[PDB]
Amino acid sequence: SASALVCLAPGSEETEAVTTIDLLVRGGIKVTTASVASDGNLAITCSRGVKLLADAPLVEVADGEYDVIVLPGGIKGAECFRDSTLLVETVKQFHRSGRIVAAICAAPATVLVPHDIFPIGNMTGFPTLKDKIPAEQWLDKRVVWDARVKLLTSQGPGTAIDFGLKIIDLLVGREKAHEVASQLVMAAGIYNYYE
Amino acid sequence: SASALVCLAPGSEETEAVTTIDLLVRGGIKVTTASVASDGNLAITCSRGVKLLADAPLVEVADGEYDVIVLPGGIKGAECFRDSTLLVETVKQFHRSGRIVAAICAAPATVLVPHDIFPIGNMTGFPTLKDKIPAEQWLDKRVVWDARVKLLTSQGPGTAIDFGLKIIDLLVGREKAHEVASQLVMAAGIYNYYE
Ligand SMILES: [Mg+2]
Ligand SMILES: [Mg+2]
Known part of the structure; x- marks a missing residue:
C-alpha cells in the first residue's frame, strides 16, 4: 500500500533518481x-545525458496519495525544483500534512534551505x-533522518542505496529494508538493517 | 577520446546500466x-519499470570503434542479449579486435557462458x-578484471560503482578513476583508486 512520488527535472542526477526508484520498487512501494x-x-x-521517461507531469499527480516526496539532486535539476512554484508548494504540502520529504545531494541546499x-x-x-x-x-552523515520534521536527507x-533503503524502512519497515539490501551485493559500509 | 557502447534490452537492470553510464561520462568517456x-x-x-531512451539501435552502432562494450544485467535483459545473434557476434568482435567486454550481474552467466x-x-x-x-x-568478488582476455565482470x-570505476581506470587511467570516485560519496569498502 505504501507509495512514493519521485520528482524528475532536466538535469536531475540519474544515478540518484534511478537507484532510488529501483530500490523502492523492490521494496513493494x-x-x-x-x-x-x-x-x-x-x-x-x-545531468550526464541519460534520457529517462517520467510517468506524469507534476500537476497531474501532486494531489495524489503518496507517503513520501523524493527530490533527487543534480545541480540543474535541483535549480528547476527550486524555481518551480508547484514543486515548492507540493513539498510544503507533504510536510504540513504529516508526510515525508526526502531529498538528496544538491536538493537540500538548493530547494529546502532557500x-x-x-x-x-x-x-x-x-x-x-x-x-x-x-x-x-548540518550533519556529515550518509543519511540524516529527522523524525521531528519527517525530513530524510542524503549526500x-x-x-543513493542508503537513501533508498531508509525510505523503505520509513514506509514498509526494517524487515523489507533488510530483504532489499540483501539482493544488491552492497558494500560493507552501508547499513543493512539487521542486528 | 575513449568511448563506450552500453547495451540496453527490455528487462535490463536500470541501476546497473544508469550508474555505469553516469560514471563513464564523469570519466570523460x-x-x-x-x-x-x-x-x-x-x-x-x-526490470523495475524505469523507462530509458536509447541513442540508437544496436545494428546501427555495432561496428563503431568503441573501446568497451557493456552488458548490464537484469535476468530478462540478459536473456534478450543471449538470444540476439547480433549482440553475441558484436561481443565476439569486440574481443577479437582487442577491445574490452564488460558484463555485470546476470550477464556473465546468461550471455558469456552459453x-x-x-x-x-x-x-x-x-x-x-x-x-x-x-x-x-568462478570468483566471488565485487569486480573481476581478467587482463589476459580483457574481460571485466561484476556482481x-x-x-555498479566498482564496475564503472574499473572501466574508467582501464580506459582513461587511475587518476581519473579517483577523481570520479571522489565525486560520489562512496561507501566504505569500495576502492577509490587513491594513490
Ligand atoms: Mg534558519
Ligand atoms: Mg567450459
Whole structure:
C-alpha cells in the first residue's frame, strides 16, 4: 500500500533518481515519477545525458496519495525544483500534512534551505555545498533522518542505496529494508538493517 | 577520446546500466546507448519499470570503434542479449579486435557462458547465479578484471560503482578513476583508486 512520488527535472542526477526508484520498487512501494519540467515534458535528459521517461507531469499527480516526496539532486535539476512554484508548494504540502520529504545531494541546499521549508531540523547534502546548509542544521552523515520534521536527507550518488533503503524502512519497515539490501551485493559500509 | 557502447534490452537492470553510464561520462568517456532485441525501438522498459531512451539501435552502432562494450544485467535483459545473434557476434568482435567486454550481474552467466565466449576466462556475476558459471571459472568478488582476455565482470546493482570505476581506470587511467570516485560519496569498502 505504501507509495512514493519521485520528482524528475532536466538535469536531475540519474544515478540518484534511478537507484532510488529501483530500490523502492523492490521494496513493494508504488512509485510514480513526476516531471517538473516547466513545459510538462516527460522525456527528461538527466545531468550526464541519460534520457529517462517520467510517468506524469507534476500537476497531474501532486494531489495524489503518496507517503513520501523524493527530490533527487543534480545541480540543474535541483535549480528547476527550486524555481518551480508547484514543486515548492507540493513539498510544503507533504510536510504540513504529516508526510515525508526526502531529498538528496544538491536538493537540500538548493530547494529546502532557500525556501525555508525546514527552519528547524537536521539535514545533510552534497558535501561541497555544506556551507549552503545552516551550520546548526548540518550533519556529515550518509543519511540524516529527522523524525521531528519527517525530513530524510542524503549526500550524493554514492549514498543513493542508503537513501533508498531508509525510505523503505520509513514506509514498509526494517524487515523489507533488510530483504532489499540483501539482493544488491552492497558494500560493507552501508547499513543493512539487521542486528 | 575513449568511448563506450552500453547495451540496453527490455528487462535490463536500470541501476546497473544508469550508474555505469553516469560514471563513464564523469570519466570523460563518450557513451552511446544501444537498444537490443527491440527491432529498432529505442524505448526500453527496464526490470523495475524505469523507462530509458536509447541513442540508437544496436545494428546501427555495432561496428563503431568503441573501446568497451557493456552488458548490464537484469535476468530478462540478459536473456534478450543471449538470444540476439547480433549482440553475441558484436561481443565476439569486440574481443577479437582487442577491445574490452564488460558484463555485470546476470550477464556473465546468461550471455558469456552459453556462447563459450571466454572458455578459460575468470569471471564473476550475481551470486545466486554462481551455478550457471562453470566452477573453474568462478570468483566471488565485487569486480573481476581478467587482463589476459580483457574481460571485466561484476556482481550486482550494489557493485555498479566498482564496475564503472574499473572501466574508467582501464580506459582513461587511475587518476581519473579517483577523481570520479571522489565525486560520489562512496561507501566504505569500495576502492577509490587513491594513490
Ligand atoms: Mg534558519
Ligand atoms: Mg567450459
